[model samples]
Target: SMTKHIHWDGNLSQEGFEIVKGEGGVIVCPTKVGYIIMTSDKKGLERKFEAKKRNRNKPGVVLCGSMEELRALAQLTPEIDAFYQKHWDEDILLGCILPWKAEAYEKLKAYGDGREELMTDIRGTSCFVIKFGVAGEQIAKEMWEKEGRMVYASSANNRGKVEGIGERIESMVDLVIEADDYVASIQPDKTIETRYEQGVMVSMVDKDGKLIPQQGADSRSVEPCPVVIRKGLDIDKIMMHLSDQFNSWNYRQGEY
Candidate 1:
């Protein structure tokens, strides 16, 4: 496969070379580029790490030198939460990949023994409940088929992208307009757009209940003062926006 592969990215030019020696010692390549078929030592991995250091510095993939520290860091509470939140926020349906992935690898080559072990004393251990939401349940079927029991999931049919937002942008927009009719039934027309704008405004409010307008809606919205209702974002779509209830009108957080 290596022979059939092409890395036009120039990764194969300098050390672009391959150690073609056979498994015992001599790795032979049958082409113009040949060698023992082995790879560079630790230096190669270090260079790769250094090159990808910036991206790996991101939430879940940073290095901790030795496996011991790496394992402990992964099991750490906030880091675990950070890793949990990253995936959770994107697709709650996919379930979280933090503690599971981290702890499994950590346990394999864990250092120390008894209570002093790095993998044994994971922080935030108590809160690591394996909870599955409705969405998560729906996405679990295929994973179940692939991995059998280990993968946690709900069911795949619950994914509604094929139903509501399925067709096209125009249809989705039409669905939004249709939804406004539903909200209008309950919400008084005297305060339609006003409610929408006010909500966006309130989202940006400080602890003291004050918000600079553009700070709430968007940076470029031209808001010097609190504008309650945005002029033209749509009511039904707004209803759909709040469908999750986290962003809905009934949502009561600091409202009091």
Candidate 2:
């Protein structure tokens, strides 16, 4: 937290929400798989990224609140669209790399034109990471409602550092969101409190183009698909469905 830092229990009180409304700081926010230090401010995020001592070329995840927001971040093919629809209800992370939009590409291209070396490591020029329930769906929704846009995020720890078990990031961060601050809008029981989890499980889009819908007796064969680079949660099923959606897949999982 910074000198003007403050904590948020996820409650958007008039004043509490105003503190970090447009200002940036190290935020302890929820992600699809776990809790981590995050911030939306470009400079703030860069400061933390350097603090972690990660390579300059490596970029963080570009988090979006909804499918529409995701569509704004990158191109979405029918296969990608169908894949998302199939797992809309599930709690998982979809790691897909896609081409940048035209307007987006111009800016991205303009940014990378001169800084060839950094450009190679800078944020996506032609592609980016797309996820639905990123940083958890609730807080993400709140982000869109409040900020009216997407946010970039990364774990509190740097490269090779284990999350939750490493040197404290509190001193390095401007604010911390504890468990007491976590709120579930769709909780069924007051008796059940959230016990934050620590690590993330990632599912990457496979290399094959387009996911074919099951046909005939093959419909019953809902097993893991081998077309993807990695597997986690319902990724197998998603990859199976998305296998036929993409005309071409970009490389997002490369480098790191």
Candidate 3:
């Protein structure tokens, strides 16, 4: 039997707390900056969406480039990349490939105006994969497994947002094909989100509107979000986004 553990990149600042809801329990963590609820557990995640749907009000966002934003807000692209990369690789799988926010963003920013974190931007750009082992997809937890600690999980490009660019995730394989130095994030279509063009899953394209890899990649968010890996790109590999079930998901974040 595989051990049950959650994935954690270097950026999970505080030890994640146990999130309890419905008839089940899972881990959770709140967002520090955005006016959103970033949860980690399967149950808490569903509850968050429920809350979002139940709420009748919407919170508007502040423009960061207002020319007078806080000094903290105005940062260099390299710094921005470093900041986000810090929180990318925390998953249940003990070993597997993840992704680097810096690389993911830089590659896309190179093609268009920078804006990868926003939901609007996310809906169209960026490509990744989520490695789900036998645990299955983590929509509502009605079908979650307790076995398998490691699975493949990465974000792929969304077709609706980026417009004409192709997915870059598939091209990365040639870059990190060796498991000794890096493991490809692969798994069963455990989660519906990864079901090619389903859920928030979308396509990623380059500036020329050409696919990054020239190969289509199936990508989605991990059912149980993992931590962010700092220095991942520099270290070759430093993250495997964890899942509760014996590494139910794989999330690697780095240049590789």
Candidate 4:
């Protein structure tokens, strides 16, 4: 397929970032989990994927650069913010139903609309994923830093199939970043030591910072505190990391 093969050093190039910001197209970039196809254009990308999958009106996660930026995109409660901040570097998706920002509300409104159950994990306007640190990271952070706070992120695949890579993807647009080395840099095989070995999965959290276990695979939190949502980071490792403060922190309602 027609695409731009990029070298992954430590970060994305300015030109590459620019390409992602402009016009909205498919970007094949390495994420913490695996290679994912991120689209610059949310509305257009969803339509494209669902059309191929024959599933209409499916909303995608809004990828943000950092927790700070994510707050700008979706309304985050103080309790939720404090808890997530503790796991800022962790690869998890936090879903919120209410939005304080107008721009964010509009995007969710357009994307989720009547199909709130499917588009959003919470019973609210937006669902967000904050990706920071390494391969679990997005190359578009630079763009989001300047242009906007969030963008559409979904698996790089045609709706019904597993994630796509190399020639496996049905190009949604003419431009694709053939990020080969970069993709390799985040995978196992000793190529790169990504943040998580299994590559962390996404989950939904409520305003109280409680892991909602009933949602679904895309939204459920695994059992246990510092839960195993999708098994990327070790629960023991996470506990040790937060041993000093995790217990003291209160998740009590309205405590924030």
Candidate 5:
């Protein structure tokens, strides 16, 4: 079968996990933001990019099942750690651009057949996402905790609608989990156009590739702070959290 279709059920995650574990396996699944195409290895990632016609220059987002996985894979400072902790506690979907740990690259090289290069950008950074919806999170958690694998993903479609997803892309995936109701249930108050199509993205590092931190009261103007690269889903709340944690932060949508 080119694609196995399944409704959102209790055992669905296990089936999805199995497909993604295999070589060159790719799946298009539901997320609170929208439908996303996900894969576990280098070949799968290549297929995802080809299916979406996306540029390789823009690396896929790494979906982390837990904060522990996020901490393990990405380099985090104490300030950034606390920032993520607060969002994790509240179950907010947050994606941050972060450089990987040296050990993380080693682990990827071992599991990903030395194609870790595809997963990172020119700055050696990847967008690490946490607490992103239910269906996708289950599969991501299984991949990370049970198999020690990383899940990489991009939006299934530019419009963020399942029906809008291209037919060719659907045919290319090994599994397709349909849950339009679940996607709508999460954001019942908002209409399709009003709902956030992606998670808010923050750049944690400065131009010199150093993690930005909360500045001292006197040095606030001169110090670097986290910048919001993309705005989506609970942006006001995210901005509030940033304000509470950092002395300074900037919102520059589409600049990343």
Candidate 6:
């Protein structure tokens, strides 16, 4: 009963925004693939992880409102930029494992909230996500535009059910933005198997912590090419896009 459940009437963005902005605040909001638990700072992220009983090793995703925001935060090469741009133009939700820019890490530290450490992994990498869902995107955009605050989120459920909010998750959050029709609206013709609960993730950096360029067919066997770390919605289309763009990308799920 502690959670404030509200229907998605297109006006609750601010409400959700404020909740996440506060220290230790957590909100359950709708996304294209599913409902995710979002938090703004370290405390809030800790709460999210504890509530979900998730491992800290698996870092959360940073929701970028726009391409500019993504550029400002992540160290993206031209090829990676082009790849992300393609997905953005197609309105497909894409998340890529990227290293944080040094200046961006300082900016996050300026918040004085210790978010710089919690939001990223041991390698100082975070999955920067774009075009997630309406409710979550609105709040992320506003936070970026208004306060330059970054929003971090993880799948709401442990089992990764990509559609609805669970009762336990709902109760643990400060606010719940309910949108029952979100899945249908985001993915019209896709079925359960096609519509994954997570967004497709690409690892832009290689094993040695270096950015991998789009390799040619001849260099495919020798060079480290971009690899798909996880499969989610639009896997087929995303794979096709990678193949078209990189010519030598690898799809090794759970490689990370």
lDDT by residue for model 1 (145-180), tens = 332211110011101111222222212111111122
> Model 5, poorest ten-residue lDDT window?
214-223
RMSD of 5: 1.9
Candidate 4 achieves a global lDDT of 0.47
Steric clashes per prediction: 27, 16, 71, 5, 0, 0
Query: Candidate 2 residues 102-135, lDDT tens each?
Result: 6755654453323223322333332233443332
| RMSD values, in order shown | 20.9, 7.6, 21.9, 8.4, 1.9, 2.6
Off by over 4 Å in 3: 1-15, 20-32, 40-42, 54-211, 214-256
TM agreement with the true structure for every prediction: 0.17, 0.60, 0.20, 0.59, 0.93, 0.89
Q: Which has the higher TM-score value, candidate number 1 or candidate number 3?
A: 3
Best model per TM-score: 5
Q: In angstroms, give how far residue 17 of model 6 lies from its true place.
A: 1.6
Q: All candidates' lDDT scores?
A: 0.23, 0.45, 0.24, 0.47, 0.81, 0.77
Best by lDDT: 5
Clashing pairs in 6: none
Candidate 1, TM-score vs. the true structure? 0.17
Q: Model 3 scores what on Cα lDDT?
A: 0.24
What TM-score would candidate 2 get against the native? Answer: 0.60
Q: What is the Cα-based TM-score of model 3?
A: 0.20
Q: Tens-digit lDDT track for model 6 on 1-256?
A: 5767777886647788888888788988777776788888888887887788888788788888888898888887667888889988988888888887889888777888677666787778888888887778888888888887778888778222333456667777788777767656776766756556677888888776666665544454536778788877888898888777775667788865
lDDT of 3 by residue, 1-256 (tens): 1213233342322222222222223222111110112222333324433433432121112111111121222222332223233323332112111222445335434534222332112223222222211122232122222321111112222321221112232221111111111111232322324322221111122333232231112444423322233231212222321221113233333322
How far off is residue 178 in model 2, in Å?
Answer: 2.5
The 10-residue segment with the lowest total lDDT in model 6: 158-167
Ranking by lDDT: 5, 6, 4, 2, 3, 1
Candidate 3 local lDDT, residue 148:
13
